[PDB]
Amino acid sequence: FRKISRDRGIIDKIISSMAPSIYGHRDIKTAVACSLFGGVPKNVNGKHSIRGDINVLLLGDPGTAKSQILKYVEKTAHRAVFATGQGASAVGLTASVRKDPITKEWTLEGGALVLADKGVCLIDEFDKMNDQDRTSIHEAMEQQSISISKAGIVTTLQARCSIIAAANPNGGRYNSTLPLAQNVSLTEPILSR
Amino acid sequence: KIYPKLHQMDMDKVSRVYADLRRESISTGSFPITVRHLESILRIAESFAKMRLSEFVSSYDLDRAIKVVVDSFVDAQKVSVRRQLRRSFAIY
Amino acid sequence: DNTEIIKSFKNFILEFRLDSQFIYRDQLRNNILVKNYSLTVNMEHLIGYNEDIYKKLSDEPSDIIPLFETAITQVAKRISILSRPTFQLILNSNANQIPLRDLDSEHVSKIVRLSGIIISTSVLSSRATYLSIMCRNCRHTTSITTVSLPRSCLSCGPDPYIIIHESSKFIDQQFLKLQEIPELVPVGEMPRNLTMTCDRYLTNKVIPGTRVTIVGIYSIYNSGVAIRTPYIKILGIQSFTEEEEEEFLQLSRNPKLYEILTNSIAPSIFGNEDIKKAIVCLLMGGSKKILPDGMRLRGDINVLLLGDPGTAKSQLLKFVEKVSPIAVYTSGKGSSAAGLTASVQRDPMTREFYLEGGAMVLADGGVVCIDEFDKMRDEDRVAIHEAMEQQTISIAKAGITTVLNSRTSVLAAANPIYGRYDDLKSPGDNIDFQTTILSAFDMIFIVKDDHNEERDISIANHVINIHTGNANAMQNQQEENGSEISIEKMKRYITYCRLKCAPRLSPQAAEKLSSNFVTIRKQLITIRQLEAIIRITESLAKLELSPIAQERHVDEAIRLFQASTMDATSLSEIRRFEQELKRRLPIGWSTSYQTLRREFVDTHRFSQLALDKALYALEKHETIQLRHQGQNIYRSGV
Numbered sequence: 076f077r078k079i080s081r082d083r084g085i086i087d088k089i090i091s092s093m094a095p096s097i098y099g100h101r102d103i104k105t106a107v108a109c110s111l112f113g114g115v116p117k118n119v120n121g122k123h124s125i126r127g128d129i130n131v132l133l134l135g136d137p138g139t140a141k142s143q144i145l146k147y148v149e150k151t152a153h154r155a156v157f158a159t160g161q162g163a164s165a166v167g168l169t170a171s172v173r174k175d176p177i178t179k180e181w182t183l184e185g186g187a188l189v190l191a192d193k194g195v196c197l198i199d200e201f202d203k204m205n206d207q208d209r210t211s212i213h214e215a216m217e218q219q220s221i222s223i224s225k226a227g228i229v230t231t232l233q234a235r236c237s238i239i240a241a242a243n244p245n246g247g248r249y250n251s252t253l254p255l256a257q258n259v260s261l262t263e264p265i266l267s268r
Numbered sequence: 269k270i271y272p273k274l275h276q277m278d279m280d281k282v283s284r285v286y287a288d289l290r291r292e293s294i295s296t297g298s299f300p301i302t303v304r305h306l307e308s309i310l311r312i313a314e315s316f317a318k319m320r321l322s323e324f325v326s327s328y329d330l331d332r333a334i335k336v337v338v339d340s341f342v343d344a345q346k347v348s349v350r351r352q353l354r355r356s357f358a359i360y
Numbered sequence: 361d362n363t364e365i366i367k368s369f370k371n372f373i374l375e376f377r378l379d380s381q382f383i384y385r386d387q388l389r390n391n392i393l394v395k396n397y398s399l400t401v402n403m404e405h406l407i408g409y410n411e412d413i414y415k416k417l418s419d420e421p422s423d424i425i426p427l428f429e430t431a432i433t434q435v436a437k438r439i440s441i442l443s444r445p446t447f448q449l450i451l452n453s454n455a456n457q458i459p460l461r462d463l464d465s466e467h468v469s470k471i472v473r474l475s476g477i478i479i480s481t482s483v484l485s486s487r488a489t490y491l492s493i494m495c496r497n498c499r500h501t502t503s504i505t506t507v508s509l510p511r512s513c514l515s516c517g518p519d520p521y522i523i524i525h526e527s528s529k530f531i532d533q534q535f536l537k538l539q540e541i542p543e544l545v546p547v548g549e550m551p552r553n554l555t556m557t558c559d560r561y562l563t564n565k566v567i568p569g570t571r572v573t574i575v576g577i578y579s580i581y582n583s584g585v586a587i588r589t590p591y592i593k594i595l596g597i598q599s600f601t602e603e604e605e606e607e608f609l610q611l612s613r614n615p616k617l618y619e620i621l622t623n624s625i626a627p628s629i630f631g632n633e634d635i636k637k638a639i640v641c642l643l644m645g646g647s648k649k650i651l652p653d654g655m656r657l658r659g660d661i662n663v664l665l666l667g668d669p670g671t672a673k674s675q676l677l678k679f680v681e682k683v684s685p686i687a688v689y690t691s692g693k694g695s696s697a698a699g700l701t702a703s704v705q706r707d708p709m710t711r712e713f714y715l716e717g718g719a720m721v722l723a724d725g726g727v728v729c730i731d732e733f734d735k736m737r738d739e740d741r742v743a744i745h746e747a748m749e750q751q752t753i754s755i756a757k758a759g760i761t762t763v764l765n766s767r768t769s770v771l772a773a774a775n776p777i778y779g780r781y782d783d784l785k786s787p788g789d790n791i792d793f794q795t796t797i798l799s800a801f802d803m804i805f806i807v808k809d810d811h812n813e814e815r816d817i818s819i820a821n822h823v824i825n826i827h828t829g830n831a832n833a834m835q836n837q838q839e840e841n842g843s844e845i846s847i848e849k850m851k852r853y854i855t856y857c858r859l860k861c862a863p864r865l866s867p868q869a870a871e872k873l874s875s876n877f878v879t880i881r882k883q884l885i886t887i888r889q890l891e892a893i894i895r896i897t898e899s900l901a902k903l904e905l906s907p908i909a910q911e912r913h914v915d916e917a918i919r920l921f922q923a924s925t926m927d928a929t930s931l932s933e934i935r936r937f938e939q940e941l942k943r944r945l946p947i948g949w950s951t952s953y954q955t956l957r958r959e960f961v962d963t964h965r966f967s968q969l970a971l972d973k974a975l976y977a978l979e980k981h982e983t984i985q986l987r988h989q990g991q992n993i994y995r996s997g998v
């Protein structure tokens with residue numbers, strides 16, 4: 076590693092190696108490169124916490140490889156969980172409820188975000204999913220945790236994972252004459268995370 | 269293994285960029301540029317530092333960090349306004 | 361051999377002397393006078409009186425506690441004969457408790473001590489304690505006191521005896537569910553639940569949601585390949601250092617106590633002094649009052665965060681979770697009415713339907729942090745309404761109905777619709793839920809993040825220091841300076857404040873409360889709103905541990921209320937400015953704030969406060985619109 080590390084200007088080597096079979100999109104590949112390495116999850120003085128992983132949203136017209144990149148982050152990151160907008164449910168992402176087959180007690184089972192702990196979560200067609208399925212993502216993108224209260228289970232799990240999302244603008248084409256906040260069905264809160 | 273650390277040398281470089289971006293979004297339909305958006309510059313700087321395996325956030329790392337973050341806000345603007353902010357942030 | 365154990369117990373009751381009195385003989389005699397057939401034996405006196413029996417009891421209580429029941433019964437009946445059933449043993453102890461996770465396969469049949477919260481209870485059931493039977497074959501009779509009937513007669517075929525019902529005795533028993541404190545549970549783990557059983561006088565003392573201290577026997581019973589369900593025979597349930605008291609009393613004596621704690625709340629964040637101070641009021645909470653008709657006033661202070669995204673509003677809730685001794689954090693999406701409030705479920709261990717609490721039941725006596733409050737369903741909100749305004753939860757499921765109390769303080773963070781709160785609109789329009797909810801929260805905070813130059817630079821410099829690591833040294837030095845309080849010490853201080861003091865208002869504070877609220881009412885808010893301010897001054901008095909709430913608390917409370925509720929003869933002068941400006945500015949014209957200052961205030965036509973209030977009033981009356989932080993003012997309507 077240190078032989079490559081001492082090479083002058085290593086940053087452009089890594090970025091040029093992000094899914095090399097995709098032409099152009101360098102200002103997008105750098106976001107993929109930066110999210111794979113992540114930041115420092117600084118638990119400042121213990122009493123304060125800040126997420127470390129970099130969240131990326133890919134938006135644009137069809138035919139721009141907004142999805143195949145997410146079919147590359149899956150094969151490159153150590154731990155990756157892939158999901159699709161309409162094919163995912165709120166319970167299936169955060170956590171599910173089960174009864175123990177031995178002790179007959181309420182037990183909880185981890186979802187996609189719980190699996191992707193210390194990894195990445197990949198959501199395709201982020202806009203087309205229903206509002207409720209999109210709502211549960213809010214906590215994960217800032218708290219990196221799943222908070223649940225169901226059937227007597229009151230707890231919180233660990234969901235440290237970056238989220239890479241692909242979407243489409245309203246009407247299927249991007250109107251360059253209008254602001255982004257007007258081009259998509261999402262809102263400032265969701266875009267803020 | 270790598271957890272680069274920070275020294276507050278480029279504080280003026282980042283802070284004035286943060287103020288500049290906020291000023292241009294006060295009356296334009298655009299991203300919700302907030303404190304969480306500033307943190308991306310520092311964290312994305314950590315990634316560039318953590319690519320070199322260095323333990324220190326150098327001035328160059330923030331230079332790559334600021335260019336990526338500021339360009340994103342400029343690109344997601346209407347055509348009539350995009351060309352004006354193209355030159356307003358040429359320092360960065 | 362075992363007679364010595366009985367004799368030693370007899371000396372420990374009849375002859376044990378403390379405080380120059382026969383405390384155990386007298387308290388048992390008093391119980392006999394009350395006709396309560398139970399005795400509360402303090403384990404700390406037992407070890408000081410006879411360590412030898414303590415060794416046997418601690419190690420092998422299998423025969424000792426049968427001796428306890430029979431010896432106390434004989435001794436108490438002896439006292440009853442002297443003065444003129446089986447007496448239940450009750451144990452009070454202050455020895456160290458074993459953590460619920462630390463219970464293992466080694467403490468079997470050993471008396472252990474635990475601490476936790478009851479999450480569910482069962483209905484009472486009758487168990488036999490004394491029986492008399494008769495042989496069906498030959499009418500042979502005998503008495504019997506696990507226990508099973510004889511297989512052959514003592515005078516007849518297999519199992520010849522039948523129970524004589526009218527000459528038998530039974531006792532009542534209850535089954536309880538205990539789990540460890542969620543605050544002591546690290547994330548990623550569901551608190552362990554433990555089944556407990558209590559009988560006779562120990563039944564029905566605790567409801568679900570009650571925090572208790574346990575003294576009992578650890579054991580198992582069959583109900584996996586050989587997985588026996590553990591359970592506890594309850595023996596006794598209970599529900600600060602001198603230097604710590606002086607330390608916290610000195611904290612109360614600190615001249616800058618209020619500001620130091622205000623800064624101490626989330627020191628990583630910059631400014632935001634008002635929202636910090638209201639959350640401080642949330643930690644203390646109000647003081648409880650009871651009407652002469654029996655109703656109770658809700659003492660919890662509930663606050664709604666209703667501002668733009670990216671204003672650390674989510675981080676504010678998280679910090680409270682780490683400072684409130686009783687803290688529950690949950691999201692709006694990942695919650696349900698049954699999960700939040702109480703529910704009824706069948707216990708598979710005893711094959712009975714138990715009443716089981718929820719998240720809003722666990723947080724009883726503390727604070728809950730709900731996030732994305734707008735995103736939860738109306739039914740969950742409806743159940744919250746009863747908890748917010750009555751501190752009760754009513755359950756009606758299957759075929760049973762019940763009502764359960766819940767003294768829960770609720771801190772709700774809500775994302776306004778359209779993403780950003782539009783100042784052109786009433787708060788009702790920037791909100792998607794039932795309007796009656798607005799009448800529930802005592803305070804709401806519509807935070808704003810309008811772009812600015814010098815404030816951003818100061819905030820930005822603060823953030824860089826945190827990632828630099830300088831904030832770690834800065835906070836420690838501030839803690840050394842006393843300007844900041846440790847998160848553990850503050851929680852210890854808050855817990856001390858809650859248990860010890862209960863202030864009450866003063867006439868001077870109340871008379872100003874009525875006068876100011878009258879001005880608020882005349883300008884327009886309901887009668888309920890003023891009484892919500894009473895909680896805030898009680899909360900500030902609680903923090904200072906003052907015996908009475910003071911008017912100097914109200915001033916900040918009024919300012920906080922004005923800076924929270926009013927987010928979106930001097931009145932004659934203000935309205936005259938409205939009259940004058942409607943002539944100076946025709947509809948559709950624009951001007952600047954400083955222009956009005958130079959033309960109307962510098963000429964002394966009106967006061968600057970009248971200028972501020974008229975502009976405040978005109979905007980809400982759709983007359984004018986303020987733009988660009990006051991650099992432009994446009995008259996929108998008549």
Ligand SMILES: Nc1ncnc2c1ncn2[C@@H]1O[C@H](COP(=O)(O)OP(=O)(O)O)[C@@H](O)[C@H]1O
Nearest residue numbers: 096097098099100136137138139140141142143
């Ligand atoms: N910049 C690019 N370089 C190479 N191939 C591309 C590029 N953009 C799109 N493609 C091709 O177009 C297809 C886009 O697929 P997909 O990612 O589903 O599009 P969308 O952006 O609608 O998600 C891919 O099969 C890819 O081979």
Ligand SMILES: Nc1ncnc2c1ncn2[C@@H]1O[C@H](COP(=O)(O)OP(=O)(O)O)[C@@H](O)[C@H]1O
Nearest residue numbers: 217303304628629630669670671672673674675
């Ligand atoms: N005044 C402030 N001081 C320090 N950090 C702040 C401040 N305001 C916002 N932040 C940053 O914002 C983030 C929290 O935002 P959050 O409340 O989660 O956004 P949302 O409102 O979308 O939930 C934190 O990472 C914090 O560092």
Ligand SMILES: [Zn+2]
Nearest residue numbers: 495498513516
């Ligand atoms: Zn017989």
